């Protein structure tokens, strides 16, 4: 018997943990995955010395914990088998594929991650605010009070994630790029560092934030927290919430302990679901919310008819560029060079303080030292120079989010022929209109690896503004990127597979009125009709957004938690 | 001040830990890597529910922690850059490549793993004994006493690893294959399960063994062990052992704490190095054993002239096959089938106990149930059937080790068009004659990611018996594999890149006499001349072997540890 | 039999490929899901580009091809001309 | 007729091709037929195959053939990477 139970240990779950453990509640949290981030439970897997010294390898850790949501049945022809080998007569259901899934109306890139800390054990840590145009309303008919509420919430989210905008300020590459783009767009667009949930520990090490940063996930009571109560149970699949006959309250949570194989029930006062945009919906549909099976509009759902409808996922465009000869030469423009590399007459100098210098002294010293210490290297950038982390945030005249950076998730055979110091990544994310016909649904016959109803998408990028925007977005990346360098062969401009970006929203969407706004939770993230059930995460977001959604989702959880502290009393100690 | 210090936390290091912590010694162990296997320190990363339910993804975790040893300078021509992009005039030293390395005399597949538990946090767990022909002598001129010593040591190694040969006995696929190969080679070759360091917990879960299984790596004293003393220090790069002027004793170990960045010295009575075949040699060469820089036979080394010479790595050949129509039909040969799948008249039956049945009742029940429950599936093998784990061990008439199995390390884009139940992997490993000219050496100018001397190989498979064997090995795989099925397109018979198999040996080799046997350690694994320095691991193995070397290496550590308990007194408590 | 092809014999593969027209190409079912949202996108794997909807892809001779030029296939062939022994011969 | 991206890294003087051709039992069920609805480029009835290598001797032979090429070829050299032993498309 707990005061609160939380399903999932990602950063939205940990947000509830932090708020409620902190306010004196007896909390239990379950995760279907296991502890595997070392002694800091749920921490970023990229915070090892070895991965910050071999950062290209980290793509392998990401790929290792992205399990695809719905893989259609495979119809590739293999006709060079030996005549003796067993050969198919048909393309029958093979290797865990989903026969419900139409391959042509899928989010084939969508994937889930099942480990303690969720996806925040691998993510890129970008945490921008949404402006009004991308954000759901929290106050009706009062634009300025809506702004102040969002500002209050986001400011708190940013402290929980340790969001900052200056961790890369001493990078030559970062500033090379930033300054050129500010110059080029002078006035018309503003560039800044990507706000990043991260703290720099040294010039070659960044402590990336995660679920652990929000809440350390250590069981309580303990010496550091002797009057808090928290227990995390890993390797427990949560399968169903039990409704009372009134559909006004949840009475238990049904679970499957994966180690013993036993099934149990858990009672609490408050039930919170933060299993992710896909798995929140799966658990609700298994519990008799929404509708199970292929959509059938001839059978109105009894509860939450909007559940699994109006889903959104962003369009993503990508390339890499190789830095221009112009930009590279500009790095060393305050240097006087005499002699020729490798003689002992060779001299690279600058005047410290010189009003005519284009760069600050610190920049010139790095360049001087690199050039003198490494006289066989043909580039003026130091080898340990941190990577760029540049953005122009979404605006009405350019309604996409942009990252001009170095992401650990490479999409191709990472290449070796071009010096890494020259390479810049470009990712532009578009916003997607919510439409009722775009759906995530669950099979009433096919089941997944955990014997739960198999997830199935029915999705196309909407015609009209979504599609026009996505193609204007592609053109913008082409135009903007040419300012910095030409494309890197094998990383040419392209749309990524649908759902690869993992920003899926609106699967359990938020609004003021269940009917009128076609929604599932209210602005306290409470499920309509039910006193003690709440949903957290990106699934709540009802709007068309291009920016990275997690900080937003956290803000909404903070507000949800105020509702809980004002409406439920913690058990005595 | 410790009684014993151990460099590295892989399973050979943990062998010393187990023996010496157990015998009452005050032990400290350092690793340059960090704890990241969840709450069981140094355990197999494949022991999560999620990875045993998505086993194809585990290749990504392996690739994520294999960092290449020596990558030659890249000379690929990229001539489709934009004219504006910075373009090279030469193939200069880029992206951490090693200019000392000849690309044509490399072990390009060789890689190291830096995490607590070492490579045993990802390995395949195959642990066969070497027969006489592959094994170094531990007793001179007495074949039968040599056998009994090896038998005593191996039996102890097998308990520490929990080696077994029946964990797969209930697999239809495993037995399908095993029985056909026994029949086909009747008499001339014997097949058995690959001995595996592993314990089955259920029909769909195997608890794979690791460094953790040898020694749990928990600091001591603790409640379970109140009179033992052990401390593990992760993220500490060990750089040098300090010799006394007599070169008869080590006086300290110099270390670099990677978190603070500070450098310290550690004193102990006994020094043990188990940093792996490559990193043991690197640490010794940094300490003035052997010779630093490109080999120069005009400057005889002062200590251990054989260090880094006579290295061996095995040749590896690979394919996959698709199971024959014949073999698949044989799975269901005791079944009477009436009706046609999917009608309600459909019936699949057998007689339990029938003397005329080719299979045991348990086999027939699985097949019956699968066929009746899954009437849309065209194969008689159940979906959760465990994978084959078959071997014919090395013999003089077939001097290669063989694995006929399913390995988590796939080498190609894992494919989806052919049902996984039909696929069998074939890996044949050859033995390599030790030659003085085959070397691992360290640069006196280039340094690696940890500012240590850059490793550089000079290696070719020896002409003569090694090469003839490797090509007869390839032919054997071709011949033997056809008995089970034809090759899977995209997995055709091939030699793998040199060193991919990660069985490198002889970099610090064992013998009776330093001069006479061209060696570095004696049969107690003690370094010649030095009272208190020992080396563990595959680097000790002086012979040409085809079988997986780790169990052997453990056996040698067990013997080393007897020497220590008989020659050094633990500090009082 | 040109001087230029006997001096650059690797290029002759291109002349062979240039006159082998496939006999029966089943309907294509490859998924292309990285089209721009603005581009025309199929709802089904309909009959495209001269493919044959009668053809089962799994019971084909997909490599079979014909050559339509004066001299037929003997304008590109390898010229191997062995006798059949009794066991192969009508 | 090379089947792959002709390669340049290994001297052509070292390279030898191996092609082993098997015999196929005639079976009534293996057919070439023509569509009464689909037509080809010359408005003639579209050719359509219904073919599998026969079970029994044909298939056993084809796999013993593959093994023979493997065994025989090793006498001359090892396989060239990117030209490894394979069945060609039917
Ligand atoms: C993978 C990835 C993800 C993101 C980025 C890049 C990469 C490669 N980058 C990124 C993202 N978001 C941003 O805003 N900024 C960035 O730069 N990524 C997305 C981000 O990582 C997610 O939006 C965020 O985690 C969502 O948090 P959450 O709502 O707490 O959900 P999680 O998926 O992280 O964790 C949920 C959780 O629940 C479990 N689970 C699932 N089913 C169950 C059941 N049935 N019972 C119990 N537990 C369950 C999981 O195992 C998991 O831990
Ligand atoms: C990666 C891999 C390895 C093996 C198999 C498959 C795969 C994909 N399969 C396998 C193997 N061996 C077998 O006999 N059977 C199998 O089926 N693999 C090899 C096996 O995994 C190794 O032979 C074994 O670990 C060797 O053990 P070890 O001698 O204890 O060495 P490790 O590499 O495991 O650990 C050494 C260790 O030392 C560290 N390190 C390195 N440098 C330093 C310095 N300078 N200071 C401190 N520590 C250092 C590492 O970080 C590491 O933990
Ligand atoms: O695909 C990688 C991208 O994935 C997204 O999930 C992130 O929000 C981006 F920051 C990131 O670059
Ligand atoms: O490359 C994978 C192989 O690596 C080797 O290190 C192992 O000993 C084999 F068992 C394994 O199949």
Automatic annotation (TrEMBL), chains A, B:
It catalyses: D-glucose + O2 = 2-dehydro-D-glucose + H2O2. Keywords: FAD, Flavoprotein, Nucleotide-binding, Oxidoreductase, Periplasm. Its EC number is 1.1.3.10. One of its GO terms (cellular component) is periplasmic space. Its main location: periplasm. The keyword Oxidoreductase applies. The keyword Oxidoreductase applies. It is found in: Periplasm. One of its GO terms (molecular function) is flavin adenine dinucleotide binding. InterPro entries: FAD/NAD-bd_sf, GMC_OxRtase_C, P2OX, P2Ox-like. FAD binds at residues 12, 31, 115, 118-119, 122, 124-126, 238, 550. It is an enzyme of class 1 (oxidoreductase). Its cofactor is FAD. Residues 501-557 form the Glucose-methanol-choline oxidoreductase C-terminal domain. Belongs to the GMC oxidoreductase family. Homotetramer. This is Pyranose 2-oxidase. It comes from Trametes ochracea (White-rot fungus).
């Amino acid at each position: 018997k707990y005061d609160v139970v939380i399903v999932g240990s990602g950063p939205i779950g940990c947000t509830y943990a932090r708020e409620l453990v902190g306010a004196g509640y007896k909390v239990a949290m379950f995760d279907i995955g296991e502890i595997d981030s070392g002694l800091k439970i749920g921490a970023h897997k990229k915070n090892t010395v070895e991965y910050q010294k071999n950062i290209d390898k980290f793509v392998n850790v990401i790929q290792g914990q992205l399990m695809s949501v719905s893989v259609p049945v495979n119809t590739l022809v293999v006709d060079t088998l030996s005549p003796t080998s067993w050969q198919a007569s048909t393309f029958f259901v093979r290797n865990g594929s989903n026969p419900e899934q139409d391959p042509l109306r899928n989010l084939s890139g969508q994937a889930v991650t099942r480990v303690v800390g969720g996806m925040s054990t691998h993510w890129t840590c970008a945490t921008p605010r949404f402006d009004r145009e991308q954000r759901p309303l929290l106050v009706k008919d009062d634009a300025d009070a809506d702004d102040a509420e969002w500002d209050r919430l986001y400011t708190k989210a940013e402290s929980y994630f340790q969001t900052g905008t200056d961790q890369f300020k001493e990078s030559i590459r970062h500033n090379l790029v930033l300054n050129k783009l500010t110059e080029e767009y002078k006035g018309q667009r503003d560039f800044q560092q990507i706000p990043l949930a991260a703290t720099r520990r040294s010039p070659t090490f960044v402590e990336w934030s995660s679920a652990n940063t929000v809440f350390d996930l250590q069981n309580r009571p303990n010496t550091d927290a002797p009057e808090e109560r928290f227990n995390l149970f890993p390797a427990v699949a949560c399968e169903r919430v039990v409704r009372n006959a009134l559909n006004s309250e949840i009475e238990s949570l049904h679970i499957h302990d994966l180690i013993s194989g036993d099934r149990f029930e858990i009672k609490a006062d408050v039930y919170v679901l933060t299993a992710g945009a896909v798995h929140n919906t799966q658990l609700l549909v298994n519990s008799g919310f929404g509708q199970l099976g292929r959509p059938n509009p001839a059978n109105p759902p009894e509860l939450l008819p909007s559940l699994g409808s109006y889903i959104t996922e962003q369009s993503l465009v990508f390339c890499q560029t190789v830095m221009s000869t112009e930009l590279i030469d500009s790095v060393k423009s305050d240097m006087t060079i005499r002699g020729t590399p490798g003689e002992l007459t060779y001299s690279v100098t600058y005047t410290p303080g010189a009003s005519t210098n284009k760069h600050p002294d610190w920049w010139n010293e790095k360049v001087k030292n690199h050039m003198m210490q490494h006289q066989e290297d043909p580039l003026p950038i130091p080898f340990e120079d941190p990577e760029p982390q540049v953005t122009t945030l979404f605006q009405p005249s350019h309604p996409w989010h942009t990252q001009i950076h170095r992401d650990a998730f490479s999409y191709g055979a990472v290449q070796q022929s071009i010096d890494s110091r020259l390479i810049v990544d470009w990712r532009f994310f578009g916003r997607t209109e919510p439409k009722e016909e775009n759906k995530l649904w669950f099979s009433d016959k096919i089941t997944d690896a955990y014997n739960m109803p198999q997830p199935t998408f029915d999705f196309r990028f909407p015609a009209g503004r979504t599609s026009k925007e996505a193609e204007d977005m592609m053109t913008d990346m082409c135009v903007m990127s040419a300012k910095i360098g030409g494309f890197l062969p094998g990383s040419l401009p392209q749309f990524m597979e649908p759902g690869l970006c993992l920003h899926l929203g609106g699967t359990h969407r938020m609004g003021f009125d269940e009917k009128e706004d076609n929604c599932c939770v209210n602005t306290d993230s409470r499920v309509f009709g039910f006193k003690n059930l709440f949903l957290g995460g990106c699934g709540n977001i009802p709007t068309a957004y291009g920016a990275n959604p997690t900080l937003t989702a956290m803000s909404l959880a903070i507000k949800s938690c105020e509702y809980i502290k004002q409406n439920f009393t913690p058990s005595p100690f």
